[PDB]
Curated annotation (Swiss-Prot):
<feature type="disulfide bond">
    <location>
        <begin position="38"/>
        <end position="43"/>
    </location>
</feature>
<feature type="disulfide bond">
    <location>
        <begin position="4"/>
        <end position="39"/>
    </location>
</feature>
<feature type="region of interest" description="B">
    <location>
        <begin position="1"/>
        <end position="27"/>
    </location>
</feature>
<protein>
    <recommendedName>
        <fullName>Insulin-like growth factor 1</fullName>
    </recommendedName>
</protein>
<comment type="subunit">
    <text>Forms a ternary complex with IGFR1 and ITGAV:ITGB3. Forms a ternary complex with IGFR1 and ITGA6:ITGB4. Interacts with SH2D3C isoform 2. Forms a ternary complex with IGFBP3 and ALS.</text>
</comment>
<feature type="region of interest" description="A">
    <location>
        <begin position="33"/>
        <end position="53"/>
    </location>
</feature>
<comment type="function">
    <text>The insulin-like growth factors, isolated from plasma, are structurally and functionally related to insulin but have a much higher growth-promoting activity. May be a physiological regulator of [1-14C]-2-deoxy-D-glucose (2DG) transport and glycogen synthesis in osteoblasts. Stimulates glucose transport in bone-derived osteoblastic (PyMS) cells and is effective at much lower concentrations than insulin, not only regarding glycogen and DNA synthesis but also with regard to enhancing glucose uptake. May play a role in synapse maturation.</text>
</comment>
<feature type="disulfide bond">
    <location>
        <begin position="16"/>
        <end position="52"/>
    </location>
</feature>
<comment type="similarity">
    <text>Belongs to the insulin family.</text>
</comment>
Length: 57
């Protein structure tokens, strides 16, 4: 539920596999990202999944 530090990174590695992840969602045209939603808060797998990089292949 709460995934912090290494455990967060493990989760993202596992869920995102080859794609990679990032920690802050992009914006645009006061920061915040996976830590906030998955570490300070429990988060679910679909939220976690949102910090997987685009595919592209």
């Amino acid at each position: 539920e709460t995934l912090c530090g290494a455990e967060l990174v493990d989760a993202l590695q596992f869920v995102c596999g080859d794609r990679g992840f990032y920690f802050n969602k992009p914006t645009g045209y006061p920061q915040t990202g996976i830590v906030d939603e998955c570490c300070f808060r429990s988060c679910d797998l679909r939220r976690l999944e949102m910090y997987c990089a685009p595919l592209k292949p």
